[PDB]
Design a protein around this ligand. Structure first.
Ligand SMILES: Nc1nc2c(ncn2[C@@H]2O[C@H](COP(=O)(O)OP(=O)(O)NP(=O)(O)O)[C@@H](O)[C@H]2O)c(=O)[nH]1
Ligand SMILES: [Mg+2]
Length: 173
């Protein structure tokens, strides 16, 4: 019959790698000189998870605060939220709780305690990390027991796994 259509939405500070993550996963391409997203964009991607056929509709958003008004209307209907930071940007990590809360409010999330969130620490390939695997993981345990993954759009480290996990989190609810 039909594939299961699931809507996942990437949220996180400007520069973290959201569009690079979506574009690495969808078209196996990476741009070193990626330009700020100013609105929203979605790309559909087909996969099989646990021998189950899914269409993942990945919504990309502007991470910058000036474009908040453009992205917030598109949060509603998301089946999962990928809260994204960069391992070389302590502020992006510190802003996770803010992203999480902005999602729950504008997505109109009735049951936030059970809503599927996945946290991605991107840019793991880069040498000077400013945020430790341990503190990232501890935050995720303490703030809802969210699965955490370290990713690199650049090297294609854990990108497929992150998006598969988003699907698994959805199917487990
Ligand atoms: N080293 C490295 N650079 C990455 C990685 N992912 C993205 N980048 C780089 O980081 C910059 C920002 O990427 P981008 O995908 O545009 O980030 P964004 O979160 O979508 N930004 P915005 O919210 O403003 O649209 C680009 O120069 C891109 O090449 C990664 O895994 N590793
Ligand atoms: Mg972008």
């Amino acid at each position: 019959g039909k594939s299961l259509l699931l809507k996942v939405i990437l949220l996180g500070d400007g520069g973290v790698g959201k569009s690079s993550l979506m574009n690495r996963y969808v078209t196996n391409k990476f741009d070193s000189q990626a330009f700020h997203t100013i609105g929203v964009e979605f790309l559909n991607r087909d996969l099989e998870v646990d021998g189950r056929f899914v269409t993942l509709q990945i919504w990309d958003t502007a991470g910058q605060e000036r474009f908040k008004s453009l992205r917030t209307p598109f949060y509603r209907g998301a089946d999962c939220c990928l809260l994204t930071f960069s391992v070389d940007d302590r502020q992006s990590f510190e802003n996770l709780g803010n992203w999480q809360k902005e999602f729950i409010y504008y997505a109109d999330v009735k049951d936030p305690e059970h809503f599927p969130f996945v946290v991605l620490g991107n840019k793991v390939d880069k040498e000077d990390r400013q945020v430790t695997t341990e503190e990232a993981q501890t935050w995720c345990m303490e703030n809802g027991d969210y699965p955490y993954l370290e990713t690199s759009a650049k090297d294609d480290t854990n990108v497929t796994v992150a998006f598969e996990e988003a699907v698994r989190q959805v199917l487990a609810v």
